[PDB]
Amino acid sequence: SHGLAMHGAPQLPKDFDHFPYADPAAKKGGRLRVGLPGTFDSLNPFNVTAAQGLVGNVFQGLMARSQDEPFTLYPLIAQSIDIDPARTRVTFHLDPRAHFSDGKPITAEDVLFSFDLLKAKGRPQQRIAYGLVKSATAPDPHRVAYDLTGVGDRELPLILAIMPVLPKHALDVERFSDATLAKPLGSGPYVVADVQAGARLLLKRDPNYWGADIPSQRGFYNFDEIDLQYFRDGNSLFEAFKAGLIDYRDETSTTRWSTGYDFPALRDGRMARESLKNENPKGLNGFVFNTRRALFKDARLREAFGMMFDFEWVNANYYAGLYTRTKSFFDESELSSSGRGASEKERALLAPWPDAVRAEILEGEWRPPVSDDRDMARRALDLLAAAGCRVDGDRLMKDGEPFSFEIMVKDRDQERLALAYASSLARIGVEVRVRLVDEVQYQRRRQKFDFDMMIGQYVASASPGNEQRMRWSSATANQESSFNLAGAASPAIDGMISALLSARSQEDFVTAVRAYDRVLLSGFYVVPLFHASEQWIAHSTDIVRPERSPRYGSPIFGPTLESWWRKN
Numbered sequence: 001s002h003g004l005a006m007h008g009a010p011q012l013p014k015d016f017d018h019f020p021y022a023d024p025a026a027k028k029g030g031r032l033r034v035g036l037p038g039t040f041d042s043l044n045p046f047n048v049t050a051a052q053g054l055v056g057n058v059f060q061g062l063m064a065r066s067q068d069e070p071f072t073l074y075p076l077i078a079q080s081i082d083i084d085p086a087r088t089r090v091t092f093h094l095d096p097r098a099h100f101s102d103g104k105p106i107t108a109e110d111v112l113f114s115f116d117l118l119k120a121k122g123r124p125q126q127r128i129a130y131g132l133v134k135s136a137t138a139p140d141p142h143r144v145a146y147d148l149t150g151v152g153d154r155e156l157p158l159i160l161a162i163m164p165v166l167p168k169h170a171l172d173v174e175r176f177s178d179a180t181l182a183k184p185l186g187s188g189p190y191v192v193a194d195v196q197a198g199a200r201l202l203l204k205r206d207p208n209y210w211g212a213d214i215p216s217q218r219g220f221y222n223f224d225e226i227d228l229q230y231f232r233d234g235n236s237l238f239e240a241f242k243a244g245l246i247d248y249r250d251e252t253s254t255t256r257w258s259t260g261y262d263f264p265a266l267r268d269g270r271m272a273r274e275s276l277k278n279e280n281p282k283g284l285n286g287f288v289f290n291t292r293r294a295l296f297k298d299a300r301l302r303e304a305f306g307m308m309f310d311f312e313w314v315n316a317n318y319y320a321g322l323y324t325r326t327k328s329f330f331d332e333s334e335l336s337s338s339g340r341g342a343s344e345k346e347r348a349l350l351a352p353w354p355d356a357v358r359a360e361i362l363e364g365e366w367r368p369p370v371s372d373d374r375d376m377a378r379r380a381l382d383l384l385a386a387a388g389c390r391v392d393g394d395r396l397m398k399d400g401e402p403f404s405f406e407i408m409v410k411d412r413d414q415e416r417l418a419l420a421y422a423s424s425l426a427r428i429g430v431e432v433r434v435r436l437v438d439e440v441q442y443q444r445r446r447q448k449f450d451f452d453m454m455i456g457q458y459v460a461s462a463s464p465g466n467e468q469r470m471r472w473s474s475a476t477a478n479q480e481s482s483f484n485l486a487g488a489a490s491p492a493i494d495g496m497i498s499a500l501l502s503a504r505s506q507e508d509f510v511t512a513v514r515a516y517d518r519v520l521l522s523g524f525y526v527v528p529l530f531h532a533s534e535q536w537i538a539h540s541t542d543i544v545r546p547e548r549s550p551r552y553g554s555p556i557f558g559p560t561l562e563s564w565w566r567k568n
Contacts, residue, residue: 001080004063006071006158006463008506019066019074022219022563023546030566031225032543034559035237035246039198039230042179046122046164049179051201052559053228057221058186058203059164062092062111062144064216067550070506071463073161074216077106077187083157085504090157091145099210100167100187108138113168115160121176125466129159154501155465187211189221201228203560219546222565244270247543248564250555251536258320261538272541275534280554281333281460282533283326286526287407287421288456290449292478292487295398295405302524304383308424309527310371314417323530327367329517330460332533334510337517340364345508346515349499356492357515358522366521368528377428384428396429404431405452410442414455417529447481456485456526462552464513468497472520486525493519542567 003010018024040051045059063073063081078092098106119130133156134147146160170185183192189212193204203226211217229246231237238256240246242263251257251273265271287309289296296302311325328336341364342350342357350357360366369376384396395402407418415436422432437445445451458471467483469476474489476482496519500512535556545564549556557563 001082002075004073004081004083004158004161005069005506006155006465007503007509010072010074011069012066012072012074016074016215018215018218019220020068021546021548021550023565024219026219026222026546026563026565027568028222028565029224031227032223032561032564032566033245033247034226034228034561035240035249036228036230036559037232037234037237040201041197042181043184043192043195043201044176044180046118046166047177048121048123051195051228053201053203053226054184054186054192055164056188056558056562057190057226057560058184058188058192059166060186060188060211061162061164062094063161064214065162066216067553070552071158073158076211076214076216077165078161081157081161087154087157088149088151089145089147090160091139091143092161094142094144095211095214096142097210098187100170100185101191101206101209102167102170102185103208104167104169106165106167106187107141108144109141110165110168111144111163112136112138113171114163114166117166117171117173117176118163121173125470126159129153129156129466130163132156133160153466154504189217190226193225198230200230202226203228220562223561226560228560241271241538244540248539248561249537251538254319254322257322257536266538269541271538273536273538275536276549276556277534278549278553278556279333279551280462280556281328281330281335282531283331283460284329284458284526284528285326285531286456286458286528287418287453288485288526289524290452290454290485290487291525292449293452295403295452298387299522299524300383300387301389301398304380304387305425305430306524306527307369307376307380307383308428309368309421310373310424311368311530312371314420315530318413318416319530322532324533325368325370326528326531329458329520330464330513331531333460333462335460335462335464335513335517337361337364337514337521338367340514342515342518343511345511346518349496349512349515350492350518353492353495353519356490356522357518361518361522373427380428391429394429395431402431403429404433406433406435407453407455408442408445408451409434409436409455410439411436417455421527446485449478449480449485449487454485455529458483458526464500464516466501468500468516473497486523488520488523488525490519490523493523 002014040049042050062078064076077098079095080093082091132151137145167185189209190203191206194202205224241249289302328338330336342362389398409415409418418434425432471483476484477487477489496516503509503512544567
């Protein structure tokens with residue numbers, strides 16, 4: 001009634017004082033200088049280039065998400081909830097203390113206005129989700145009742161709970177679809193104090209922020225001002241940090257992390273760098289096979305081709321040895337099947353699908369092959385022979401023709417990865433053309449699935465949900481512009497997605513995701529690439545953070561460092 005976990009029970013007691021990764025002793029005051037790459041031209045993050053830093057700081061949901069749990073929400077604008085275990089209904093009881101930053105009280109009328117507006121004009125999956133609601137009503141000005149009878153979507157109440165609450169009295173609905181630089185009205189701890197398009201967004205504390213002493217807010221929002229500055233590209237952003245004009249940065253360049261942090265402020269203690277890790281799952285990016293095309297229809301051939309990617313060579317030659325191989329769609333986490341034998345409960349979930357999981361993966365013995373290479377080439381050729389492909393002279397033959405294909409790439413980093421892979425595949429007689437295509441052609445060809453192989457992303461989450469259908473369901477395998485780049489269309493994938501979507505307890509959810517991981521991996525739809533096991537950050541020593549960081553989420557801290565504060 002005062003907490004909502006996607007699976008299982010909320011881990012904080014009803015009377016918790018603060019989120020465990022917030023420090024209530026955090027000091028108030030000072031200006032945080034944040035630096036971001038790129039540009040912006042809008043202060044509306046909810047239409048379909050908006051400035052960052054507005055969600056949370058300005059625009060608030062009904063409930064606040066604790067990043068210390070996979071997916072659990074706690075009271076914010078809604079002080080409590082009424083929900084049944086089957087999730088056919090949810091009513092939000094609004095906090096009568098809540099008001100927008102002009103002092104206007106938040107009422108059910110604002111929530112229904114926001115629901116209607118976002119259902120019509122929001123992001124695509126948001127429109128679909130809100131469209132599932134049977135009715136949205138206000139039995140009184142402090143209650144919002146959502147009818148979900150017949151939907152069967154256990155995620156929908158939490159999606160409704162994180163909808164931003166927008167001011168009916170102050171939002172022009174006809175302007176919603178435009179790029180707007182007018183200072184927007186919200187209810188959060190900060191107001192928009194100054195904006196210079198493409199240059200800076202200045203946030204200043206609302207001294208009368210309604211929720212400053214709400215439990216889910218205590219210890220957060222300590223800076224009096226947050227200045228979000230936008231920079232051309234990475235080098236000028238990095239130079240501003242070295243000059244002391246920017247207080248914090250995330251590092252994503254292996255070259256810069258490896259050799260660029262030898263400047264004086266780093267050595268004399270004015271700034272520091274750190275690697276941080278939490279329990280958020282990692283992965284997965286990879287070379288994607290287009291299994292719609294005859295040359296990649298056999299999972300045995302896809303597995304064999306995957307054996308030839310030499311990660312150790314690329315890691316040492318391009319990335320200063322800083323990355324680690326991705327081994328799972330939910331890698332380095334409790335959701336991973338990697339190195340874990342399937343449980344009896346997993347095997348029961350998989351029972352209707354006896355062909356779906358390879359024994360090597362079912363028993364937790366499988367990993368993407370590690371190179372030191374005749375043994376690896378020999379393993380690949382033996383598998384290929386079983387798939388009916390044999391090397392004639394210097395060429396691998398399939399259906400009487402030499403095997404050849406194209407890897408479509410979009411930038412130089414991808415091209416170097418693909419060229420390394422092409423060189424390895426040449427050793428088993430496979431001709432691989434690597435073609436760098438411009439942005440417009442790349443996007444069009446990705447949307448139409450006009451490729452043999454390309455590099456794709458399937459970002460892991462600590463609470464996988466309906467987005468898995470977009471990436472892997474049979475229904476989206478042949479739908480233009482979908483995320484299902486490989487064209488996977490497997491009843492066992494669809495069945496495991498259904499099982500993870502219907503799991504109720506956290507233990508049954510973990511079981512289903514592990515089994516789902518095994519089915520995805522056993523299809524060899526992708527050649528997994530690699531990830532950083534830790535987040536690389538650097539910061540001024542004049543700002544500090546709580547001793548305990550959140551267990552989940554990536555990046556670990558928000559762009560405006562809501563839990564940090566200025567040292568006294």
